[PDB]
Structure 1
Amino acid sequence: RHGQKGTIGVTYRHEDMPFSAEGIVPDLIINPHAIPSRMTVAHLIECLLSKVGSIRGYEGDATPFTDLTVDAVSNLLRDNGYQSRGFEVMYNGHTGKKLMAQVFFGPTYYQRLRHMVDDKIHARARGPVQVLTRQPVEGRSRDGGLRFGEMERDCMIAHGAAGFLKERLMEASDAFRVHVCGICGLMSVIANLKKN
């Protein structure tokens, strides 16, 4: 609940996770680099407070602008047999060897947001076209194609990939054959191909 959002990068089965001496393994793991530049110190304090809260059996009051201090919560926690700042010794799951560093560990409220990958994944080979432009349709729900916009165009010029850019915008899209008159230059030719 602190603007610390992420996607799952991999899953690990129970026995490969790091574990504390009590055999508790974390359910979800986040990265230490998310904290110092974002300065969501409240996220850490919530973890600390919730640890205390689950040991003694109540929901801590985390209302803003109260007399609750970090030291008061830390005092309670140490009196229950855990390190005062929330750390715990943990063991690497692959080898059983201790980690040289201790790991901040505890409950945190996490929320499941509406953006799931199988609602976004999309691919198109060939497919339906617009009646008017004979170009690929717009949108996931219509088997559409991605937009090669103006800024994409510029990048291929910078690479000097002139051949690639031609193919993308013709053979891989709405290529059409027309006949012109060599004298007047208009597309006014009437071409019956079976009568030649």
Structure 2
Amino acid sequence: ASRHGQKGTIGITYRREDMPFTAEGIVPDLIINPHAIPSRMTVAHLIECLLSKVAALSGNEGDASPFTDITVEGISKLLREHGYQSRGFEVMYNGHTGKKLMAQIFFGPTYYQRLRHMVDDKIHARARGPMQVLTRQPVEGRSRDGG
């Protein structure tokens, strides 16, 4: 998850070839769905990306701090001085065929926290295991082999 309640789990993992890409070469480490934006409304998320795509290129630390004097119109101008679209979007070629993508993408470096909670600490399956004493029913919890 990022720092915007934009939590999500891994569905699959592709490699560089399979991955979609941009002329520069640059390829994503993560691909989250455009659908997690419209109703979540968390826009700053969208902004941190832009800003951070500049701070990436400029080496200068990008301030995101609360109520300051920094705007979306401003950052966009700073990103045009470096070379890429003033809004982030970039052209991409579908990793399987190489043909361009009819669309453009919001490709940009964003901070992501690796929340604890990895699958292999939850995955649990039982079939006739340790039975309780008083009841004689199964026992509770995956740790004690429960059901």
Larger Rg: 1
Q: CA RMSD in A?
A: 0.6
Give the match for residue 107 of structure 1: 109
Considering Cα pairs closer than 8 Å and 6+ residues apart, tell me whether 1 or 2 has the greater RCO.
2
Q: Calculate percent identity across the aligned residue pairs.
A: 88
Provide structure 1 residue ranges, at least 5 long, that are not aligned to the other structure.
146-196
Q: Please report the TM-score for the alignment, with normalisation by the length of structure 1.
A: 0.73
Within 5 Å, which residues of 2 pair with 1:130-149?
130-145=132-147
SS of equivalent residue, structure 1 residue 102: strand
Alignment partner of 2:72 out of 70, 73, 79: 70
Code of the aligned partner of 1:13 = R
Q: Distance between the aligned counterparts of 1:98 and 1:14, measured in 2? A: 16
SS of equivalent residue, structure 2 residue 108: strand
Q: Distance between the aligned counterparts of 1:66 and 1:140, measured in 2? A: 49
Give the match for residue 125 of structure 1: 127
SS of equivalent residue, structure 1 residue 14: coil
Alignment partner of 1:85 out of 87, 97, 120: 87
Shift of 1:58: 1.4
Give the match for residue 13 of structure 2: 11
Code of the aligned partner of 2:104 = Q
Q: Please report the TM-score for the alignment, with normalisation by the length of structure 2.
A: 0.97
Code of the aligned partner of 1:89 = V
SS of equivalent residue, structure 1 residue 129: coil
Shift of 1:114: 1.0
Q: Distance between the aligned counterparts of 1:79 and 1:131, measured in 2? A: 73
- Structure ranking higher in helix proportion: 1
Q: Distance between the aligned counterparts of 1:128 and 1:89, measured in 2? A: 57
Q: Distance between the aligned counterparts of 2:49 and 2:103, measured in 1? A: 19
Query: Deviation above 2 Å: which 4+ runs of structure 1?
Result: none
Q: Distance between the aligned counterparts of 1:123 and 1:8, measured in 2? A: 21
Provide structure 2 residue ranges, at least 5 long, that are not aligned to the other structure.
none
